[PDB]
Amino acid sequence: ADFKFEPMRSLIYVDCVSEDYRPKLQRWIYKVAIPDSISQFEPYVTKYAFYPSFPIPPQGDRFGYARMQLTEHHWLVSDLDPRLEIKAIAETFPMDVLVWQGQIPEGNPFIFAFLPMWWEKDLKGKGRTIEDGANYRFNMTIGFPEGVDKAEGEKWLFEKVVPILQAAPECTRVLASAVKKDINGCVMDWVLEIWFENQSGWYKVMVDDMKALEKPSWAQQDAFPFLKPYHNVCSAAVADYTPSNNLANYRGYITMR
Amino acid sequence: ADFKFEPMRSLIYVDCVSEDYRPKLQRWIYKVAIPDSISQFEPYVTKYAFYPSFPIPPQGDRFGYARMQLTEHHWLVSDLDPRLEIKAIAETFPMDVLVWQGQIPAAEGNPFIFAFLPMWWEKDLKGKGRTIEDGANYRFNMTIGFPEGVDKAEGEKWLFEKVVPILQAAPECTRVLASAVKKDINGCVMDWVLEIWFENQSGWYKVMVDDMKALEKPSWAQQDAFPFLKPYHNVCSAAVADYTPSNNLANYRGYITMR
Amino acid sequence: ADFKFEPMRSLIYVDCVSEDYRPKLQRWIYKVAIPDSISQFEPYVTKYAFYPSFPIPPQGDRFGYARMQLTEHHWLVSDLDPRLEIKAIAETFPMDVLVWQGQIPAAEGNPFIFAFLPMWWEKDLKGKGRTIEDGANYRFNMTIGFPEGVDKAEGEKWLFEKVVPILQAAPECTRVLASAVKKDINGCVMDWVLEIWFENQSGWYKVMVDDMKALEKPSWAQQDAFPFLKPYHNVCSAAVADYTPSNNLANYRGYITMR
Amino acid sequence: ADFKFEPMRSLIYVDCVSEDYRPKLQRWIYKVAIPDSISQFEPYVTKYAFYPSFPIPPQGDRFGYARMQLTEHHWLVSDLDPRLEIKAIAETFPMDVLVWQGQIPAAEGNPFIFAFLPMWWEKDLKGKGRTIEDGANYRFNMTIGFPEGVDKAEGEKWLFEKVVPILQAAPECTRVLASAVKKDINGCVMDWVLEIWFENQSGWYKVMVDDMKALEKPSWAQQDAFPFLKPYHNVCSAAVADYTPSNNLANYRGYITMR
Amino acid sequence: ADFKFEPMRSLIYVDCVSEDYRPKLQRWIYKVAIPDSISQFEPYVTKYAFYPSFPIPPQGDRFGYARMQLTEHHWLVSDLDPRLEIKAIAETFPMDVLVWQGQIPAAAEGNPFIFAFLPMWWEKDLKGKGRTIEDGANYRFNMTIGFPEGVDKAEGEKWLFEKVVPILQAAPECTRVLASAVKKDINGCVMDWVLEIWFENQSGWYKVMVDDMKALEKPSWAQQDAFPFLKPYHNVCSAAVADYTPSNNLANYRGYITMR
Amino acid sequence: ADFKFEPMRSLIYVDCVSEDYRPKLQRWIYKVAIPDSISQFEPYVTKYAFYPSFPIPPQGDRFGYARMQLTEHHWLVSDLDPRLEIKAIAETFPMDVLVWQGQIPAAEGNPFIFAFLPMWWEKDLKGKGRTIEDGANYRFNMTIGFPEGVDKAEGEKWLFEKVVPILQAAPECTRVLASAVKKDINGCVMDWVLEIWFENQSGWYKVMVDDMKALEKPSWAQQDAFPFLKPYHNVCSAAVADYTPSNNLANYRGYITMR
Ligand SMILES: O=C1c2c(O)cc(O)cc2O[C@H](c2ccc(O)c(O)c2)[C@H]1O
Ligand SMILES: O=C1c2c(O)cc(O)cc2O[C@H](c2ccc(O)c(O)c2)[C@H]1O
Ligand SMILES: O=C1c2c(O)cc(O)cc2O[C@H](c2ccc(O)c(O)c2)[C@H]1O
Ligand SMILES: O=C1c2c(O)cc(O)cc2O[C@H](c2ccc(O)c(O)c2)[C@H]1O
Ligand SMILES: O=C1c2c(O)cc(O)cc2O[C@H](c2ccc(O)c(O)c2)[C@H]1O
Ligand SMILES: O=C1c2c(O)cc(O)cc2O[C@H](c2ccc(O)c(O)c2)[C@H]1O
Ligand SMILES: O=C1c2c(O)cc(O)cc2O[C@H](c2ccc(O)c(O)c2)[C@H]1O
Ligand SMILES: O=C1c2c(O)cc(O)cc2O[C@H](c2ccc(O)c(O)c2)[C@H]1O
Ligand SMILES: O=C1c2c(O)cc(O)cc2O[C@H](c2ccc(O)c(O)c2)[C@H]1O
Ligand SMILES: O=C1c2c(O)cc(O)cc2O[C@H](c2ccc(O)c(O)c2)[C@H]1O
Ligand SMILES: O=C1c2c(O)cc(O)cc2O[C@H](c2ccc(O)c(O)c2)[C@H]1O
Ligand SMILES: O=C1c2c(O)cc(O)cc2O[C@H](c2ccc(O)c(O)c2)[C@H]1O
Ligand SMILES: O=C1c2c(O)cc(O)cc2O[C@H](c2ccc(O)c(O)c2)[C@H]1O
Ligand SMILES: O=C1c2c(O)cc(O)cc2O[C@H](c2ccc(O)c(O)c2)[C@H]1O
Ligand SMILES: O=C1c2c(O)cc(O)cc2O[C@H](c2ccc(O)c(O)c2)[C@H]1O
Ligand SMILES: O=C1c2c(O)cc(O)cc2O[C@H](c2ccc(O)c(O)c2)[C@H]1O
Ligand SMILES: [Cl-]
Ligand SMILES: [Cl-]
Ligand SMILES: [Cl-]
Ligand SMILES: [Cl-]
Ligand SMILES: [Cl-]
Ligand SMILES: [Cl-]
Ligand SMILES: [K+]
16 A cells, blocks of 8 residues: 655656757647646646757757756655556556657657755855846756766765856856755766856866866766766756646637737 | 545436426426525535536436436535535535435335545546547436445456446547545445546447446446446446536526526 | 627527437547637636536427526627637537437427526516525526417417416516517517526416416417427427536636546 | 627725724625626726725824725726616625615715726826836825715815925825816715825825915815815725735635635 | 655744735745746655745734745655755845745844744644534634743643633634644754644634634733733744635746736 | 727737847846736737747748747727826846847847737738647748838739749648738738748748748849848748747746756
């Protein structure tokens, strides 16, 4: 019988591999994914929201930049509990959505990271408010390649990478949670959000300041983040606010006139 | 102090024993029951909804057919925890509502069936993977409880080995789902809840009446024909649509009157 | 350029000619008709709502009883202005909906009754000052149009001098209201819309069937008994509650499916 | 047929003549007045809202200070068109509400002040261009009507030549706005509505009491001090905030009770 | 990892120490506090609401009467779990709000911030069980108390329930009495009890909470001469509120829309 | 007194001249513009919405492509009526917003294009009857105004006799719609607004760039290629989806920040 109280925040990195797919993928998301979703999890999800990603910045491709959105659920129970596999009504989820997102064409894994509802580490910019200004919120998840010691990767991240973020005045905030791997075997290890004022601030720090970094022995590309795009790193730059707070705001797929 | 996280889906089988009562019972439900309810459980119920039952089909009376609605709560805690008996404001619940629902007559009355379930169906026995796009569903929700002194394991075995296969054989039946009732919560006499989908009333009839004549009449039967259980006492049911506009936590804006 | 301020209340009498059609027609209405509709007229309709009809009462068939609902719009402009025919996105309206409503068979076929009215009742002939606290109302909404070649003044005189007094005499009848149909808008064949309240179905029957036998059968009668008009062609009706949860502009949150 | 497009903003000055009445009057307003109201005018009112008045300031009694709220409707048509008198469902409006508001006593009562205005202020006499970021406003809304047999032109001249300049001189006063009352609608005795903003109650006092002592007492004065008009009869007022949570068409979700 | 399921009802006693502050404090609450709040706790709070207090009644000052509102959260987890201190976006909460509420003087002794955690359901129902909304409009006097330092808690409880409550039960003017014990283990709130005591109106409140209560033995630990015998705003806070608020913030809020 | 019933649809072409400005401009729009706006026009605007533009396509710069959104109001009265200039609270509109949108540099600046239209399209030139089920639309909304000293009738003739036929010839173009700009309202320099649908960006390109090379370059042309008009000055545009979540009158619940 018993079901564990397991409050978590999920993030899904929704890419769009081509502008010709955008109308169709966007349609599916807003016309189909929302109602199918709420139909299933309304009673045990407290917040379902989409954060459309800003235009892909220069060299964003190398950070597995999700060109469509982030998809953010707040769960009261583990959606991977086997008993939750049973649904009266099932979702409409065509093959085509996976083509559009880039799961299918070599093809890219579906990154679904589970987190505790609150950030575990606050490494810069504590006490910042909304009045302090509009944030270019760079959300990035990473997973160290196979056969790399996790403790060693953690040590690299926090002792080599983060200090560069702390040094940069262009970087207003740094936050990190460790991925709940015990839930869905997500290959990612960390999720970070790193705020800037704008795209140029992002570039200056995440490209130029980061050239200073020693290229690690396990690197899957020459430059930071040294991890395989869309496979061992995904990301998105998003705004402080979304109008797509789906549990509160959705009123059907109303069409423009 | 401690309060156990106990996520459940409740169903109440709301009958209406006479069309002359319908205006008044419907009024109570939508004008009074909703605000009184939300006033009490808003902080620990995630979804409160009413699914109006379709017109009672031929021989529906024999399945304890609730002629008004199903009432569906999603709980985060056991509403039968004794500490939850204390309410600043109490509900308005007249005698008359029980007359209307058939709990009391003008000449024997009917129990109030309030079944607690896990939020997710336990058994998916037909039609897995069906979506809303596959078409409009005549959703026959039926709960049953085996008569007193009938072994539960034996009743389970009957249900799943004799009854369900007839549903599986029938092309008219698009879906079959079952959960075992949480009896430990409120001593509900029912044992199972099933939802059995059809295309329409005729599909329902063809299977639940005609195909079911084939069944061996069990020794404990309380009526001659399937479901072999006493209407409204050991079986209640309702046929409902996929969608309700009465999703009360989101949708309610007061008892606004027609012009 | 100029667009006339034309505040009106529309009523559409939505029938359902068979229970096997109900799931599918209900689906279309709530899953498709609503969003397609709001997509088009949100900026110039102040209220869009559906009032599900109560179960068809005995002999309701003879009053063109809409077995599904009433569909009620409040317009700021004439939807029949020719310039309003152009829509970026058009509605999905299958042939099948007309089968289900009885506009076509799959056994003669019934017109689509869409009556335009002023937003306020023109005549208040009984029960003025009645409030919601006075009790739950069985609201019988009925529209009528006199057969071809019948003088309109003469029909009016019949209605108000012969019919209405029987309603006024009956204590079972709590309210009587009437507006004259705007015929100048969409050529609707109906002439009047009335709402006649009772306590319940039996009150309705006692008055609209039994008390009405007393009436002189007029020379133009299209059937033996009141209302003396051809069902679904020259009379449509529905009995509805004071309240609907389907106040679509405020309440709709998508076609969310039961679990 | 034709109904004139008449966009207006109404204000009703809702007093509460005793603290012992506040619970009951407040209940009526929020439990009964809202749903009865929306039930009637939803299709032709674009905004219905209540602005609770701040605590009555010193000597506010002399300005006909409404100790409960302002009631603010935005109309698309004249509610005083005679055809709008007919309502299917009528409102619940007990005698007691009039006692509570002070229309009737337990020993002379007070008129019901219902002022119709154009939706936009006619005169902007101070503080043009002020935004919400400029700070929180103590908004003193005051309506006045000159006693019987006082020339209106002469009263206007007094107001704009003697009164207004004192407001303009006072740095404590951040804003001055005025519309002339639509008298042609409901024969409201009032002539002007003004809103006069301060930072706080003391600012209000300093200007509307102390600075105003400077004023010549006019020959028609109905009291010794400004505003020289009979409280609640020829002057009503209220001090309100920039924001109300009671924007009733958008926000109302029923009379949900505290736990 | 694990986070405990801890369903609770919080109450915050929001005072306003001067009418000249009311516009500004009210603005902050409705323009800023709400969105900043929902931005943080939307996923684990089921109900966030404000109950504006009725006008301070005669001698209400002596009961630590919050002249602005009550602030009522329903939590699914302990907001005082240390891991909940981390927020992406932090709240805007100026010094000035503390001046307005009376936590600080503007340039000199202030008043503590009373934030009481409770179980979601009342623990004791001591009068008026079964009363409905149809029974009439309620003057709901919510009052929290905490016994002075070095007063035995069991002894204070015994005083409250054996001396005070019977006066409430005797008074026909008092329609309801409810009490929960404060969860002290959560945030070290100095208060011990929260009670709600209903009347018909302000005069009913006065007749009972002032006049009937004169009958009471003045305890040895008393911090003022008259009931409630506790230091205003420090060891007792209160508010009289209506059955209904329009500020049910999770459901109702549509932005800080300004009057025209 | 009188206020004319003037139902209209406005469009504002909101550009964003640099990605470094997007966070800040987007913030202003969603945090400030919305509440300031609703605070002013809630009672006489039936729909306020934002349609975020898709990524600027190849050579979109030449069509005055608004890189932020379209801003769409539905008015019941002319916002340019002089009496509507008076507002109690005024809007917060920094210099910086004009920098971000490109009205000013920190080169050469760009006019603020605010086009008023009838609520319904005047000309339906292709794809009549198309529904939402027919598929997802790349909706290219484009407004144009003919250079100074060009006869308007002659420009109209060019548009409908030369340009539109190319759209009609292209199977890649699923829809063509046009309204004439109400110039009598706000002296907007634009003359027409068109919406031209494709399947996707490539369809847009193939037709609006490649097929359009076929066109005779007119004598008044302000650039070599179609649309032959000065970007952002005599032509603005945006490609948008069928649906926006930013339907501000229904959906806005404050500036809630991500966690
Ligand atoms: O319930 C689910 C769901 C849904 O209800 C609606 C919807 O529109 C998409 C969905 O997608 C979820 C999903 C599918 C495949 C995966 O590989 C995965 O990780 C998650 C699925 O579980
Ligand atoms: O919006 C969502 C979403 C999406 O936008 C894109 C995508 O590719 C998959 C998705 O799937 C999400 C989901 C739904 C139900 C579940 O039970 C679940 O685990 C995940 C869904 O809500
Ligand atoms: O909270 C409750 C409640 C309520 O608040 C409002 C309302 O309108 C009806 C209600 O009915 C519930 C109930 C009553 C009698 C029973 O015999 C039973 O099992 C359940 C009760 O629990
Ligand atoms: O709609 C409801 C309902 C109803 O429609 C019919 C009926 O006969 C009883 C009911 O009672 C339900 C209820 C309310 C509060 C509770 O705490 C509870 O356990 C049950 C109520 O919500
Ligand atoms: O706007 C319209 C419309 C719509 O927007 C949505 C929808 O779901 C059905 C609709 O149907 C309307 C209609 C009126 C009269 C008829 O005789 C008929 O076939 C159809 C149509 O005009
Ligand atoms: O619900 C509705 C409805 C319906 O339920 C049944 C039906 O058979 C036709 C309908 O059509 C209505 C309609 C839509 C658009 C219009 O422009 C119009 O005048 C009427 C629609 O709103
Ligand atoms: O319909 C109305 C109405 C209503 O629907 C609801 C309500 O709660 C109060 C109301 O009161 C209005 C009114 C009554 C008496 C007057 O003397 C007056 O000037 C106005 C009336 O118009
Ligand atoms: O809030 C309202 C209100 C009120 O709060 C107090 C009061 O004493 C009268 C009132 O009457 C208002 C009203 C309703 C309908 C009308 O047609 C009308 O003209 C006025 C009502 O809505
Ligand atoms: O002392 C004050 C003050 C100040 O010292 C400096 C300054 O730049 C602006 C100010 O303006 C404040 C204010 C004025 C009018 C209001 O209506 C309001 O809410 C606030 C006031 O507090
Ligand atoms: O001494 C003064 C003064 C005064 O004598 C009386 C009075 O009633 C108000 C006053 O206020 C004046 C003032 C002007 C501008 C401000 O911004 C401000 O705070 C105050 C100031 O000149
Ligand atoms: O008496 C007053 C006064 C004064 O006499 C002298 C002085 O030097 C300043 C003053 O300033 C006060 C004031 C000004 C503007 C406000 O906006 C406000 O609330 C208060 C005013 O009342
Ligand atoms: O800049 C700000 C500020 C500041 O710099 C210093 C300081 O001591 C207080 C402050 O407080 C401002 C504020 C006042 C009242 C409110 O109601 C509000 O939301 C914010 C804030 O903006
Ligand atoms: O998160 C919090 C918060 C917030 O987000 C928004 C807001 O407008 C007020 C707030 O106030 C809370 C608080 C303040 C002072 C205290 O002394 C205290 O105990 C708690 C704080 O925790
Ligand atoms: O309304 C609220 C509020 C208030 O009105 C006044 C005040 O002085 C403090 C407040 O603080 C509340 C709060 C408490 C705990 C939190 O963890 C939080 O985020 C916010 C906030 O919700
Ligand atoms: O009311 C208005 C308004 C507003 O309320 C809020 C807001 O955030 C921006 C605004 O801008 C509008 C506007 C700006 C520039 C123009 O050139 C023009 O014609 C109109 C203005 O009218
Ligand atoms: O969103 C809007 C908007 C905008 O988004 C961007 C922009 O650059 C100007 C704007 O101005 C619009 C406006 C407001 C009030 C009015 O009276 C009016 O005519 C226009 C506003 O609503
Ligand atoms: Cl039998
Ligand atoms: Cl909601
Ligand atoms: Cl016949
Ligand atoms: Cl709404
Ligand atoms: Cl005169
Ligand atoms: Cl060129
Ligand atoms: K060319």
